[PDB]
Amino acid sequence: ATLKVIGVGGGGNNAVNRMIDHGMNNVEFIAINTDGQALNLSKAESKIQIGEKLTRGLGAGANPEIGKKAAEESREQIEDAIQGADMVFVTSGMGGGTGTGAAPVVAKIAKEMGALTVGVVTRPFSFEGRKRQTQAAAGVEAMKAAVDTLIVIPNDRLLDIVDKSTPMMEAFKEADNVLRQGVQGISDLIAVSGEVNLDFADVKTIMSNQGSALMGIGVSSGENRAVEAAKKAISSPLLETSIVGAQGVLMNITGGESLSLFEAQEAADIVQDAADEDVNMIFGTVINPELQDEIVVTVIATGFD
Ligand SMILES: Nc1nc2c(ncn2[C@@H]2O[C@H](COP(=O)(O)OP(=O)(O)O)[C@@H](O)[C@H]2O)c(=O)[nH]1
Ligand SMILES: [Ca+2]
Query: Does any ligand 1 atom lie closer than 6 A to the CB of residue 96?
Result: yes
What distance in Å separates the CA atoms of residue 14 and residue 206, rounded to the nearest whole number? 29
Give the CA angle between residues 49, 87, 1 to the nearest 5°: 120
Q: Would you say 100 is a known binding-site residue? A: no
Helices and strands, number each (H, E), in the chain: 11, 11
What single-letter DSSP state applies at residue 194? -
Residue 122 alpha carbon to ligand 2 centre in Å: 30
DSSP state of 25: T
Q: Where are the domains of the chain?
A: 1-209, 210-305
Q: Which residues of 170-183 are buried (b: 16+ CB within 10 A; e: fewer)?
A: ebbbbbbbbbbbbb
Does the Cβ of 14 fall within 6 Å of ligand 1? yes
CA of 253 to the centre of ligand 2 (A): 11
- CATH T-level assignment (fold) for domain 1-209: Rossmann fold (3.40.50)
Cα 145 to Cα 286: distance, rounded to the nearest angstrom: 35
**Longest CA pairwise span in the chain (Å):** 62
This structure was determined by X-ray
Distance CA 98, CA 66 (A): 7
Judge whether 1-209 and 210-305 match in fold: no
Q: How many residues does the chain have?
A: 305
Quickly list DSSP for 65-131. Answer: HHHHHHHHHTHHHHHHHHTT-SEEEEEEETTSSHHHHHHHHHHHHHHHTT-EEEEEEEEPPGGG-HH
- Domain 210-305 falls under CATH 3.30.1330.20: yes
Coil, helix or strand for 7? strand
